[PDB]
Amino acid sequence: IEMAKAQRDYELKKAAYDIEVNTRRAQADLAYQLQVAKTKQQIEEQRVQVQ
Amino acid sequence: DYLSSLGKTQTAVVQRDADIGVAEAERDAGIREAECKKEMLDVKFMADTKIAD
């Protein structure tokens, strides 16, 4: 019984921490695409100004 | 086999006592070993929780 008590006490916190780390990693992965699009805005703004 | 039959009465009484004693000893060993295992798992899981944090 106490075995399962400790198993819960460990697993629940591990999952709760995993939620936060997964959210932050998901944000970090797509920050690159967000910025590259934001600057491709100006890239295209000038690549059409030449026209 | 008169006498061999007559010895049957107590040839098992000592075996009875030996079985009772070994059963009690194994019971005590098992209970206290389970207690030790429980305590060590609790502390190990607390340490692992801190590591996870």
Swiss-Prot record, chain A:
The chain holds residues 207 to 257 of 427 of the full protein. The lineage of its organism: Eukaryota, Metazoa, Chordata, Craniata, Vertebrata. This is Flotillin-1. May act as a scaffolding protein within caveolar membranes, functionally participating in formation of caveolae or caveolae-like vesicles. It is found in: Cell membrane; Endosome; Membrane, Caveola; Melanosome. It comes from Homo sapiens. Heterooligomeric complex of flotillin-1 and flotillin-2 and caveolin-1 and caveolin-2. Interacts with ECPAS. Belongs to the band 7/mec-2 family. Flotillin subfamily. It comes from the Eukaryota.
UniProtKB/Swiss-Prot annotation, chain B:
It is found in: Cell membrane; Membrane, Caveola; Endosome; Membrane. In skin, expressed in epidermis and epidermal appendages but not in dermis. Expressed in all layers of the epidermis except the basal layer. In hair follicles, expressed in the suprabasal layer but not the basal layer. Also expressed in melanoma and carcinoma cell lines, fibroblasts and foreskin melanocytes. This is Flotillin-2. It comes from the Eukaryota. Belongs to the band 7/mec-2 family. Flotillin subfamily. May act as a scaffolding protein within caveolar membranes, functionally participating in formation of caveolae or caveolae-like vesicles. May be involved in epidermal cell adhesion and epidermal structure and function. Heterooligomeric complex of flotillin-1 and flotillin-2 and caveolin-1 and caveolin-2. Interacts with ECPAS.
